[PDB]
Design a protein around this ligand. Sequence first.
Ligand code: K
Ligand code: K
Ligand code: ZN
Ligand code: ZN
Ligand code: ZN
Lengths: 459, 459, 258, 258
Amino acid sequence: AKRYTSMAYANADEMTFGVSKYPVKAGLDLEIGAGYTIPEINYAPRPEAGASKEKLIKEYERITTDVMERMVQVGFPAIILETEHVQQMSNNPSWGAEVAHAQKTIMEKYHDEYGIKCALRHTIGDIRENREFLQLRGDKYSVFLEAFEQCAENGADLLSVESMGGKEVFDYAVLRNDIPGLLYSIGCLGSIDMELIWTDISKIAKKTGTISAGDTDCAQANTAMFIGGGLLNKNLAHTIAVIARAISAPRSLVAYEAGAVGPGKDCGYENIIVKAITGMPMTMEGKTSTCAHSDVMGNLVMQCCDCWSNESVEYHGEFGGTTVQCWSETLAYDCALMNTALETKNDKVLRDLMMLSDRYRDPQAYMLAYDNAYRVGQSIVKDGDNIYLRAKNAAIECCNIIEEGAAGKLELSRFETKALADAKAALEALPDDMDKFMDDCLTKYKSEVKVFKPENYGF
Amino acid sequence: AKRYTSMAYANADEMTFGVSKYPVKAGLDLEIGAGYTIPEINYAPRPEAGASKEKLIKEYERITTDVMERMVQVGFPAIILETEHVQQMSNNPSWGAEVAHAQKTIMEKYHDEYGIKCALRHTIGDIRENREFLQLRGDKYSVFLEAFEQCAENGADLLSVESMGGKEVFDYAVLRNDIPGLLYSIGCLGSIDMELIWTDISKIAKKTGTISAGDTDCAQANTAMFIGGGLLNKNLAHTIAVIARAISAPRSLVAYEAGAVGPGKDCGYENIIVKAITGMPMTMEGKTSTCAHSDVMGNLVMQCCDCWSNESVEYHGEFGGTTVQCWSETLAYDCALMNTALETKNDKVLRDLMMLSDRYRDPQAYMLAYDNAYRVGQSIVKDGDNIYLRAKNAAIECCNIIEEGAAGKLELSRFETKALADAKAALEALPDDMDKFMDDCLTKYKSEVKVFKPENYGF
Amino acid sequence: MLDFTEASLKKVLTRYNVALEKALTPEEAAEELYPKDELIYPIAKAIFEGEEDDVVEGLQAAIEAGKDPIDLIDDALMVGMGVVIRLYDEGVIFLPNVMMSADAMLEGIEYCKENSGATPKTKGTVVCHVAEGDVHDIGKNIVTALLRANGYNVVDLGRDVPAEEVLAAVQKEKPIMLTGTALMTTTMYAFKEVNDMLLENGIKIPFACGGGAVNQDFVSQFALGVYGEEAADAPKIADAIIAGTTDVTELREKFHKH
Amino acid sequence: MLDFTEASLKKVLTRYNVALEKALTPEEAAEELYPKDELIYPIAKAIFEGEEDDVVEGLQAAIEAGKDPIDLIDDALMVGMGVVIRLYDEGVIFLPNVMMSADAMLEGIEYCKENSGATPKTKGTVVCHVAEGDVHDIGKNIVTALLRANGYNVVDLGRDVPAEEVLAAVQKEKPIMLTGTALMTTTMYAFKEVNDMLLENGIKIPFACGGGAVNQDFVSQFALGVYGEEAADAPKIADAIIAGTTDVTELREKFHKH
Ligand SMILES: [K+]
Ligand SMILES: [K+]
Ligand SMILES: [Zn+2]
Ligand SMILES: [Zn+2]
Ligand SMILES: [Zn+2]
């Protein structure tokens, strides 16, 4: 709704981890972006626990107890718990609500005993879909909103979702090196959907005195990343994955335009670009989220993180204790290193060290390096009012950034270089006018993708 | 054999991570302490894999393939695999040999294709024991040696053991705040057994062209730490755990005196002291070994590591891939940060940041801080020819160190403080003459500990 | 901000993929494999390029300067495709290049389906599905695309597919092979229902199981189960049914062992 | 090298144990709990202090100025020990203080043997063992102690214990409760052997299982199995046998639900 047309920071060099321009106060005495990074632990219940509401509540009480116990045994000052709903917690609003209430109760107990700072994030499933297609504005919509407000009324401090707007056209395009289809699905359909939902979520957050935290392009940009996989895969050019990431930034940006205040969702790798624009805090994930997946920017993503996440891990036993204890201890220590750097005014060198670790590992890391991310940010805000053109700007800026890198020390394969050159040309041939582009794609994808329903986006 | 009476380094500030004064060359184009840190991945097969030799060999093949595959997919330039023998691999020497062979074969295939540097470490089991007692010089001794040489002849690059000298008296002493018993078990009995085995181990390394790597006081010092547990535990005062650690330093030092060259075993937290004395490279484990256990010095132990380990994890599936893959990726990334620091001449500040992170977390961490570790180093070499007296010096120096800490910003509980004070007085009441102490202890533990067999120590 | 020297970077990481890339460009590589049959040529090249118009254009001229109405599928489309598949296995091209190519071929097949009545011939039917409760499409689609692109008829049962529906389709279509894909722990056990309900109706065909949440040990507790990790493993196992092996134990022996 | 300001240290970590420590020294806290019975007092202070030389001397003086050789077990030794356990529970003293006190008390119990003839009496018999293949003593030793401290009699079967031998001990001593401790995945399965081989010999006493490698769902798969995660759980689960609960499912209801 209220679009960004300038940057929150004067230059990339002002950005650092654990501080952001507009901090968020939430939960039990916690502050985010306020001069300390925070570990944010994620977890998935075992398949059996999903059988009933009571089994699910119990599993999450074991998770929460195990986590808070570990934090106080190792002396950590602060922790965030993120509960990513299984579908049944969102489809039945009161289920997620009762899990939220049960978790908050154990956290309040540890906060009263020890004074440990903490907050709870609930991430509602995007349930606006059936077996045949997306139903972004249908019957499930009202249930979607009830899931948010119920969890907000019963203990959740931060509200997030990984929304599905444009996912269907994305899925078709990403498999086909259809760059304009990437632009339309992520930058356009995604942006439009994001504005609808985030407007409502923020209203709910305000009414219930909780925080409208943010979204992630996980359904599109992360999918491109996983299909791309490691350095030796052959399923998606990494030079195209990175372009998807560039476009994801003005899409994810819309949450904040529409009332969200951060921290953004861990799996929003694009959050570095978003932070450079909004000056809001963001959670990141990388080397300590390998329990969920491999990535090629393990250290770099820490560069300006405010919260540090393990993404997800099943809840089960390891020699060192419970899965959620093992990873929360590692996240917490990573945050201790960063906090020691802040307290001693050595954050900037450490931020640089983190960035440089991965700058040259892959075009996907290269672009996300805080200086290059800020550059992408600049390219979006110069047409900030225009959801299409800002996204197109980002995509081409991305291409320029990678080309420059490749002319220095970024070592791309011939194949990667070609895919990049093809996509830049595809992007430069597009019209500047949004309507022109929106209309051509509407009729193109209506035709090429039969599961694509324009009513999902108010068309 | 040849005792240390001076320090390899002129002062603590010369110490850093990824470099040691005396580097170790080994395996497939790998170098240790040569200007880069190296991840060292550990693992335990599932119970089912122990049925037959072939299932065991198979499990290790899967582990090895999974690790090498991940390293090349994420662009990591180096890796060490450590296989800690299950008991059956050591009791039947050819079992360990054949696992060694199957692992090296795969490692060669990857090294040939991609040029990734790697080395294989086999850690023989200390099998010199039966159901009723230690048998450190019994019939099992020759089998013990056969394990080292068979593995060394069949692909193992580094040779290690976690040896049990003094374990029986330690186990008795640690439950009783018997500080002198700690001194005797670890410092005296431990040191005597260490010299026997490491003379033979080194002889074998030389004969087979492999590396006599080093030992760990796991069986004593780590037991004390694990019983000490978290900050809120009530099983062993942390001020007694750190004393046990200080004494382990000259015990573990014996391996090097007797011919090992490093890198020492990961669970040798006292390796920081050992490095300061010897200038030899050492593996460490902390924040990224939480799959095996919690500790109270997650970041500090990186301060001067040469290799960086996850200690151990069961081989099984996680969302992100196989357990050895998730943890190897985190280790390798931790190394990448360190190596970037080195490349840009920022290692010393990062070293300080890692150290300062945990310096105040616990007395166990405070002492292990590289400046304090060095000081404990100095207290050892000033009587280096004398194994009792050097150990007593370390224990008393440790007490001094924690006390100075406690008068500064180290915040000890009353209970911790009293227990330190009781231990210092008990150490200070002991005689300087070794034979006296040896004789007092011989007769005291003969009477108090029925499983104690003086012949295990040549008495 | 910090930067590396060339020597430093070289020490810190290695993009292993760069040095393993073959010298020839995809185009040059394709050129070494195209038939020089003048008539079949510009079709094979058109498939490789994912350029559907040129596939049609090239098919119109080949039935006018000769015949082969239905044959052009095998003589021109499946030869063009055999080039794409080859280059994909050798890693000189990537998945999307195969997808674009299969799209261009499918439109070239259905254009033959309009100048025929003859009904085309396939190596056999394969039924594909995603375990019920699971929306994860991609891996199935890549199994779908590879199969078709290797010369198989594919009835793709779609996403949240509920067993009863699978049973019914192995009946309607009598396929040589069924495939399954699961990605959530909350979902892999729909391979149960299907394996049991194929047995509880007397059906004995290979059940190629794959998916992120799935490994070689999980599919072995099923008599019909056969693991494939790569999507490129689906047609490779389907070809072992053209060879005669219906026995699952014998398939496992020449396909398992990871 | 770097150091923190006080303000900074306070932000980066918290030694949570420090603020939680009660004000009374252990010494003053035991003082409040000692029986003020003149002749019994020096023996209770002796037990807490874990000082055996003063335990005998205090006991001798007690049987001289009064009577009660065997009676002092429950009047002078169990009362002092009960102070020790309370303070351990409240966390004002640590394990090694409990151990030294148990050493001191056990050396008192056998000095009461030397003036008895009458036989001492206990609340039942517990057999304790570590799984076969397993060398991890410590947890078993803590369970041992806390059992001997809560008034029970314990035959300690030791380390690497083969099951045939658990049978034989359970037969001889007719215990009310069997404890087992396993620490390795490679070793927890010795509870199988034990459980089956008790049912196959028709015994139905509760088998309370613990150790690092073990959890609730694991012990529940055996019929005789009870879980207890902490060592304190050992007497608490044995008190319910003395309360008259022998049914595993009845016992589990109170003690599972972790
Ligand atoms: K997620
Ligand atoms: K070990
Ligand atoms: Zn996500
Ligand atoms: Zn160890
Ligand atoms: Zn696990």
